[model samples]
Target chain A: DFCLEPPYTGPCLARIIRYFYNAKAGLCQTFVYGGCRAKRNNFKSAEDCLRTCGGA
Target chain B: IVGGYTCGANTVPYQVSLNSGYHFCGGSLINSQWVVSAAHCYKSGIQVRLGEDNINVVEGNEQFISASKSIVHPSYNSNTLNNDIMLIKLKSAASLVASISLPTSCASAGTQCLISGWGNTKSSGTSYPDVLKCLKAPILSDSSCKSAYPGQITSNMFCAGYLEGGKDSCQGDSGGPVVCSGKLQGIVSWGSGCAQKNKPGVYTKVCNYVSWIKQTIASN
Candidate 1:
């Protein structure tokens, strides 16, 4: 699952807030995401991560 | 306490205390149904008290209200703590308290602004005050802020306070108002420590989220 993967901050300067699912913690956490080339683990919100990853 | 004198009653009419059985964080009433605060202070079952000065005393002018919902910005990151802002929607419209005006423009470096809160006075120990405390801190330059907290600050945040260290918002002060010219310039967000040398208090730059705030309130 994408949730199991660690977050990847793309090579850019745009510091946008994005959520990532923590597989071990079984919860969603926030990280600074570059505006471009966001990876699959990145989510728009915690709810989105939980819905997609089935952490809820 | 908090390296500042006690604010007089009704001096900061828009200041509010966000409580969950006890005063935990500070906030500013923006409109009858909305309050602006730091996203880090987000918690469930929050109760907002408006027009309050002394939390220990029974202030007659205080209005206790419940929050219908709380909305932290979509991009708020707990790890980096970027975009540290939140809005609380009151369950009912306020009738007794005045709302503070939103910022018309961003505050610049060296602009002196007032920060109010019931945070700890000392940096090392717990010293929550009984009444509201306030101090004037000048906004520091972006370069100054970045140097003070290298790689920690973002465009959505700004620094305000003396680099030499004396006054600042401490623990329990998160989500408090940093008002410049009677408009909310920032919200107390994070810092290295309270009033430490070369470490100024950082705030969520309110001007950057003005459109998000207005649109959220209008659409909600």
Candidate 2:
């Protein structure tokens, strides 16, 4: 269960959820979800995702 | 008698033991190659014992495995103790004996549960080391537990331990399993205080991590 921080917008929420679903279905691994404070959404980069999602 | 307690007599024989020299906690036998524990229990170079008690003293008939990697929850925060769980991949797979039980998914609510460890018998001191202990408890309402420990208990967490303040997983019991209806419901994570009146043991909800567990197991 990836928990997002807060201030969630509809597009960001949709993108994050879609990315997570795709990641899980394709890689068989679920990525951690987070993003409380305002920040840029860069789901394309693994490093950025790790930073935004917190370390695994 | 020499190897500690027998299977089903007092302890679950095949389960994993998480000992941090002075403390002893409980863990589960996910498979021959892996053991699931709390991230906080992942002290570097800690020895994982299977099929034994008197962890430091007992030798014969006991199996010990060294950890190869520790995979802690990505969102786990050391300060807040949130997401306080991890999985240990052993350097080698353990050979299962008669005592070990594989973890299973829990049924939704009203499930009977049990927790066991060698943590502090009483609330405010260090852990014990003589004999492994087991306690019977039940799963409580998520809302109730959340209300009890607000801002701490998340949907990723579950609650166990007696609200009466006698039986629970204390300090040394971190990373242990909360078995419900014969299935793994959660892992002993954190709590307000050990056995404090009205405060129950907070656990990392297993259902939330089912996907991770399945993927990790399949990969290994």
Candidate 3:
């Protein structure tokens, strides 16, 4: 359920955490970061996903 | 919240379909001879279709008007998506193609507006729609929108969407219109993403360039 260092990848694009959305889990659960801007209802944090489109 | 229902046939007559290869972007019938759309929505924008609600059809009311000239704001920035304004002059006046008016005063925060477009509903979906989609969103305060995008937001741009991210007009299309109080207020410029939390859609504030538009129209 995890990976990455300090700048943890957020659940979505262009947010502070910078993460990837795990298609299988239907959550922005991965911690892969990107360079520029991107968007969609992704969890920039655990709380964001848990409350919205992912598991806590 | 994500899907915008299709519009009635010829519902938005002022709405111009900037379709060349496909429903690439949107423009407004500012007048019979001119169309204003987001500069970023250029490229295939030369094929201007008027009186069309669905992009993939040959409607009885549709008129195909190719662009005679296209003018993107000289200072437009593609990277940051700033000054994202564009105007295309029709080879001849498609006076039959209805037109819409612009706002007399700039739209204020809290003012609810209607945005019509041919873009996709949600960000992840790849299905392109030929039927025009319209959504109503409130204009968010500049300060909040600025804070969200950091330095990306500017005077030339403004934000419109919901506090609870759901529906928004995304990229891959430009030069679409945002109507506030029945008058054009903004043009879909860019966005962080479609229907994302907190982040709303950014648009070219049309009020800022009324004079420029007048001058340009008079000359051309």
Candidate 4:
């Protein structure tokens, strides 16, 4: 899936990982992806992408 | 170490004898009527003395002339202290003495020159007594000096000192002469920590300012 690639794919994967981590941690069930493509373009790392994207 | 001493209660003598009473570092008797010194020495109220060896005793019947006017280089900058050269015009012309002569050449790279003054013999202290002391050192290249003191030596400046250090022009020696090749080349200005090793004494390039000096003096 070239999940780590630039543009939308990276961000989408990042959001999924964050949601999974949050759910596993039993922190929040609300899975939110703030325009996965935009999130991926802004952040280099999945965790950072998720934190920023999750906020949106 | 041999020349090290205190200033004591002796009055600091001007480098040249003139009524201006400007405490000078060193100067050359260019002509009977004119004495050339650094512009930095040209404070509003200063005096110039000539021919006296020990400023404390004032024994020698040295010639004393009051300055009629002081001409400092117009481009002289107090901030960088660059282009810091000036000439003292005596109220009356002086008689050409046998001991003094006009300089013909400035110190160049790889050449040594003589510098004399009444400044502090050691670094990190005040000036010494009005007694005249002299030292000899080689002229250093601009690039070489700038390596030790960045942004300090500009086009208007030249430098001279012993690379081994422990020998230099101290405070109150500013506006003095650095003589080489029979010509006055440098005017003592500033330096990095006084007497520090590898740091040379910076001076205003007198040759570059010759035209400006001639014009300024002619007008006066």
Interface RMS deviation of candidate 3 = 8.5
- Interface RMSD of candidate 4? 30.3
Q: Model 2, A1-56: lDDT tens per residue?
A: 24242222220000011122232222212321221122333243444455555432
Q: Which candidate is the best by TM-score?
A: 1
Q: Which 10 consecutive residues of model 1 chain B have the lowest summed lDDT?
A: B119-128
DockQ of model 3 vs. true complex: 0.04
Model 3 misplaced stretches (Cα beyond 4 Å): A1-56
- Ranking under lDDT, best-scoring first? 1, 3, 2, 4
Please give, for residues B173-200, the per-residue lDDT of candidate 4 as tens digits: 6665676765677777766656777876
- The best-first sequence of candidates by TM-score reads 1, 3, 2, 4
Worst 10 residues of 3 chain B by lDDT: B119-128
Q: Write the per-residue lDDT of candidate 1 for residues B11-123, one digit (tens) a residue.
A: 98888998877777789999999999877677789899998888878869888999999999999887788898889999999995688999889988999999998777886
Candidate 1, DockQ score (0 to 1): 0.04
Per-candidate Cα lDDT values, in order, are 0.82, 0.59, 0.70, 0.57
Q: Please, what are the lDDT tens digits per residue for candidate 2 over residues B1-79? A: 1111223532565456764443345677777877777766655775677776555566576777787877887787765
* DockQ, all models: 0.04, 0.02, 0.04, 0.01
Tens-place lDDT digits, model 3, residues B39-121: 66655336888888667777678888789889887787766766777789998779565788967899899999888877656
Model 1 CA lDDT for position B78: 72
Residues forming the 10-long window of minimal summed lDDT in candidate 2 chain B: B1-10
TM-score of chain B taken alone, candidate 4: 0.83
RMSD, every candidate, angstroms: 8.3, 13.3, 9.7, 22.2
